[PDB]
Amino acid sequence: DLTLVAMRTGREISLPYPVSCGLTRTDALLQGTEIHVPVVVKDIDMPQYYNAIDKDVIEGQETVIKVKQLPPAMYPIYTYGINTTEFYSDHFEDQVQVEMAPIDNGKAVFNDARKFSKFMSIMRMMGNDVTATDLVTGRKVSNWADNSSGRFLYTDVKYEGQTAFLVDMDTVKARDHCWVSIVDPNGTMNLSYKMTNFR
Amino acid sequence: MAPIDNGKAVFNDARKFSKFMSIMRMMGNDVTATDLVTGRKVSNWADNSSGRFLYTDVKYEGQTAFLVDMDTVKARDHCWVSIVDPNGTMNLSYKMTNFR
Amino acid sequence: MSSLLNSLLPEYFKPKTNLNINSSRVQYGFNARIDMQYEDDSGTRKGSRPNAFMSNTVAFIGNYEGIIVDDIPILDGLRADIFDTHGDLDMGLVEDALSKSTMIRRNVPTYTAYASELLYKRNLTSLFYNMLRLYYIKKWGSIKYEKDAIFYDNGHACLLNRQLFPKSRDASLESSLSLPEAEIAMLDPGLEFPEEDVPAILWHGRVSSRATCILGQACSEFAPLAPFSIAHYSPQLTRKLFVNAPAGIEPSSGRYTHEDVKDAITILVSANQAYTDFEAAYLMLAQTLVSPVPRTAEASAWFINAGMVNMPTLSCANGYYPALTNVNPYHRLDTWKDTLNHWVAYPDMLFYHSVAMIESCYVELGNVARVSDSDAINKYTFTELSVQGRPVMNRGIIVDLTLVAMRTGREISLPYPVSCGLTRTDALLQGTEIHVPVVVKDIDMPQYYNAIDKDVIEGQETVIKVKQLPPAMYPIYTYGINTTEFYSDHFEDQVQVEMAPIDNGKAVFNDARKFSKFMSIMRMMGNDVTATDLVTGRKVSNWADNSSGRFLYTDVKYEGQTAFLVDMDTVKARDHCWVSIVDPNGTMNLSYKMTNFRAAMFSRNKPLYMTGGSVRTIATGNYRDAAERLRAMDETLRLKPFKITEKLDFRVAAYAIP
Amino acid sequence: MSSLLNSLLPEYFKPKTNLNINSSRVQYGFNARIDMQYEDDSGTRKGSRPNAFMSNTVAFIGNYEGIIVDDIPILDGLRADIFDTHGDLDMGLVEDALSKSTMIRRNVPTYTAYASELLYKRNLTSLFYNMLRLYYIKKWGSIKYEKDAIFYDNGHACLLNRQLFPKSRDASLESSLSLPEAEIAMLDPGLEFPEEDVPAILWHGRVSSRATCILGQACSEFAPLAPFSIAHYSPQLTRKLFVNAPAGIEPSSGRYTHEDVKDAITILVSANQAYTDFEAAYLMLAQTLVSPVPRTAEASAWFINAGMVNMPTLSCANGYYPALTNVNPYHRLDTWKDTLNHWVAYPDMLFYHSVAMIESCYVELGNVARVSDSDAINKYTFTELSVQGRPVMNRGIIVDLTLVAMRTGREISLPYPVSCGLTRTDALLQGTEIHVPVVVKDIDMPQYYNAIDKDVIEGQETVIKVKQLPPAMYPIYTYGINTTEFYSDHFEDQVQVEMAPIDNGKAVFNDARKFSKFMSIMRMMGNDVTATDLVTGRKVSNWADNSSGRFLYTDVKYEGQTAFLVDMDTVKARDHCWVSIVDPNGTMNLSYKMTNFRAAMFSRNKPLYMTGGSVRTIATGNYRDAAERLRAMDETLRLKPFKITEKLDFRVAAYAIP
């Protein structure tokens, strides 16, 4: 636990005695096997999003989700922009440039995985419900997959494969309050934000 | 060359796809790919008269990703250069002489 | 040792990750372009072979037997403090190390006494060997062995799988073995006296239901039905195996996927710090995995008698004393985790490393067989002069790595002098003619082969005599890295020979070297010439091997001195380029160039294509944060190469120190 | 002393830790390349044996009998304060030391009075000796002894195990002894007056359940059934043994392994500070671990009567005076812990140290038996002039160490002049005829051997009269380090036999020296020569051994005038790899050359290989440099970080060191 803190802050932690007592967290990681978490369903269109065991499930049924790679359990908040990585993208200033031509009728394909993550994340700050669909596999991902942090990490796809995300920009829905509207875009889009003060 | 997973190679970029099918045509390999957005089959052997591949043979303005069928690569016209299984970075250098 | 066997592959070839093997036979070669130029007294002629396929054939069939022997301990993974200023294990410091890392100090005198006896016999190489074999049985578990199939087939003679492998039946690779399960018990902490002749191993967290079944079957006896390379007979490793797991082990499931065996190996190595033990097992499997299909019928003499695989005894004392294994391990080389990191990333790469190793051994044994038994370096005393360490016995891997050094001409070095694996030089080290059983296909068989019965009928089972062992394989991957006169595997070469006077329709070739050069030219032009050996009275043919398009002098099948009567009237035209002429006149000059190499693999008379992505390099430098190279070149194994010095005889080979 | 016995081993010999002995007979030796030559007026005939095996057979059987004798006290261990300037117990500082301690005040005056007698009872050599024998009995317990087995056989004469050892039943070494346990009582600290004639020892913490069983059996009578060397007859050391352990003595377990005996020794030496006592016990066992199988039939005279082992009486008064032993002991030599530290690390090395000592002794007693009594340094007075100390009696280890000093040609130094162990020079000093029994095979025996009967039918039990004792072992480990002309153990040697054509093969050797070299070199060449003495009329054969393959002059079995007729048309070729003497004419010149040496061991007519780690030369400095180091790295858990680094993919993470 102390060696993980040393990696986060980026400093040298020193104790007087090399004592080895307390909780061990790295248990499910080192096993390197599939884990079967139980879930009770609410809607009927669940198993498209989550990697479920059943393909058709009536509401109020107890199902199982197959988790292979462990997603992050917490988002950095106290350690925000002290030792920044491009995965979490916990910057004060950030921008993304999605390049579209008028010949394309709103439909954009993200060949790159990095800028797809930043586009889907900044659109959620702006209070827009985007629903992308993978062209190779045929699954779907939604940027609204959290009600705490309000960011989109790439591990919300729940699948490691080839990157071909079709996003249709005439099915974008305004969900939250205090939001900027994308009524009908034409040409190159440039999104950007700035966090100024903290309380 | 894109990684061949089962018997299919995904070409996400547009420029790289144009260069790939342009090489395989000069070698003389009738390759058939599936456009993932539309769901229609493209073929590099569209025009027989002029022995070249233009990107307009896809017949879809806009952005897409192609799934190339690497198992069903037919051998129409074979010179000694002609290979079926590409591996890594493909280099083709040709010279045209003796016009009449 | 990945970096060693990876170097053997040719510079042009870089193989991809995956390879879907779906048969018990794989051809491997290259498609080269030959530009020949002919000149004689009549005039000049220029041609060009546009596509020429030179290939060997390798199979998954080889009769092997396991023996449990006592070998050296691998002292890698133990804490660095117990070792003194030199590279030696001091029992004075083991007492101190165990004392400081406990509150209960009553048990220190007892713990030290048992530890001193067990540390000098620690070896997990035999456990990893069986775990690796279980991985490949599950992965390639759809390969069929038919009993009434062909082994070698030329046209005159034939060998079936009934012969060479009696006591065999028709079975798939998954159907070959029905392994039992050894008792995987839990070591409760509190037991004071370690039970003797039972090893104890560490584990990360809870032992999975699937991990139990793998460890149970890895320790059990292997009893095959069909002869397979990766399912050979092995004795029982242990009866029990303790596992010091804080969380209790689960009962055995019964079934496991090939993916589950990777998870079992990765945990077992990481916990025990047994990285060098894995490197031994990796090299040990590279020898066994594949076996050569013989070039000619005489080259079946190698694979009659069952070669012995020396498996080290399974012992480990990490479970009892987990204080000795800590966060600061002792290692001799800084590149000591490369072999595992290579395998876990690219499992199917072992096939290419195995083909590269067995080729290098069986090519160089072609030369060692021809060495006269009245020189400094001969078949008996070639290993002993080469090695510069202190192993238990010059057996197993030491013999194989000595032949790789002689091939490449570079100094090979391992951290520990391990003597574990297959010994090939058994048929070689005996002054006796070997009786290869064969089947007669054509009535004129006794004229070609040295048969017992001089009159035969199509269908009869006879026996042929082999005195000197011919080469089993031709250089393909190791083509032109160092060229001997025997093989003549040049890129560019100018062959010059003087044609003998054609009296009636026959040309007498009294000299041995001139005869070899003549039939070598006529083969490259593509003329099937047949000559009569005057001493024996048997017919030789340059078209002996179709796969590799070259002529070796061992195709005559007569050690000693002779004169050949070549039939110049009956020169058939099998393959004709524009260079190809039938009537040579005076001094024959042939100058050829080989360019445009490209690797190709064939399986079941169709092209076998490589799948997956491109292999990115994984490799660690000589220093991580180490200041001074403390040489420590006393215990380390070193193998010195020998260079072949050609002499006038041509039939005899001779080695010298470079 | 580990140091002096280590130097006796050859330079080419590189020993390993473990030696898996599974029999009661070992043929230790070396493989050498002999280049023999026979020059003559007709021409030269060259030979070459690439692997020539020169061996000395060593067994685990030998009749010995222990007797309890009075020996000097060993004062190493007691605190350095009580000693004066000269180095003897200054009584007055003892009374001062006891007064300023944690002793009961009413016991001080009565205990001080006894000190004059009890403090000079310090000799634990007998206890350590018995505890070392229990270690090797349980380790090599599976070795067998058959009653009707062949002790010696040379074709003509045979000597069975029934002949030398009557009252002998066939049994395994483990099943030989049935040791009864002596009482191990706890010493009451509040005892009125110390009980003399009852030894009291110290212990660290609690006496374990197994330590009671080991100490109980160590201080008991050895009454064996089979005549084994490490299970010979010993009297009862003591009836009762006190142990000053505040933590109570647990009752006897009954069973124990060989590892538990090492635990018992290491606690006993550390508590009592008795390292010099252990060094004496180590050298004692080195003599009487293995006995040599006789080279010739008439060399069995050494092992007819049982040689007495001198075990010093068990006497220790540390239990009564705990204050006088502390962490600052008095020692003469600085390297006083080296012998124990060597044994704890490498227990099985004692086998090599044992054969080195007996081979050194029995070689020198060979060429000591061939000196006339009328001389300065002779049979009776070779020990007195060499010894420059003050031992009680010239017996045990003093006689064996002085013979080693003569062999190697160096000065052997011990800290205390202790006189305990086996005495070998018994049959020599008697100077009388010895009657060895023999069972005959052929009917023409009594011409060769000096037998009691002149005509004896096959299968009869006869007697041979041995007057002068022949050498029991040939020098092998000490080959060409201190060469004498008797053994003729040179690397290069030659002999010139001068004959004229007028003589029809018949040569008479007037000289005795060159007759020995001729007969010896002819046996290397594999020729069976049979000479006949002209004066007496007896016969000698060069083939009188199947181990070394040399001819010593003591094989004549008679001292007289030298006139040996050898007929050189009755020479028969016996062995393989031999040069032929078909028909010689003129002067003969024989010669050989030994070039290289490789250590080899044989057991049950199979190769016995050394396994385990590489044995080093342990010095006092190599451990105490790690004490100087102390691991001075302040024991503070400093965790260093890793900065994550992003690259093209971004899906997978990569950590850097800085």
Numbering used by the authors:
A (entry chain A): 400 to 598
B (entry chain B): 499 to 598
C (entry chain B), D (entry chain A): 1 to 658
Please quote the paper that reports this structure.
L-BC virus persists in the budding yeast Saccharomyces cerevisiae, whereas other viruses from the family Totiviridae infect a diverse group of organisms including protists, fungi, arthropods, and vertebrates. Totiviridae is a family of viruses with monopartite double-stranded RNA (dsRNA) genomes, which contain two open reading frames encoding the capsid protein and the RNA-dependent RNA-polymerase (RdRp). The capsid of L-BC is organized with icosahedral symmetry with two subunits of capsid protein, named A and B, forming the icosahedral asymmetric unit. Decamers of capsid proteins are stabilized by domain swapping of the C-termini of subunits located around icosahedral fivefold axes.
Two-dimensional classification of particle images from a purified L-BC virus sample identified 87% empty particles, 9% open particles, and 4% genome-containing virions. The structure of the empty particle was determined to a resolution of 2.9 Å, whereas those of open particles and virions to 10 and 3.7 Å, respectively. dProtein geometry was refined against the reconstruction of the empty particle. However, the purified L-BC sample contained 87% empty particles and only 4% virions. This indicates that during the sample preparation, the fraction of empty particles was enriched or the genome release was induced. The observed particle damage could have been induced by the freeze-thaw cycle required for sample shipping or the low ionic strength of the buffer (20 mM Tris-HCl pH 7.5, 50 mM KCl, 10 mM MgCl2) used during particle vitrification. The alpha-helical cores of L-BC A and B subunits have nearly identical structures, which can be superimposed with RMSD of 0.6 Å. The strand βU of the A1 subunit is inserted between the strands βJ and βK of the A2 subunit related by 72° counterclockwise rotation when looking from the inside of the particle. These strand insertions between adjacent A subunits propagate around the fivefold symmetry axis and may stabilize the decamer structure. Salt bridges at two positions stabilize the domain swap between A subunits.
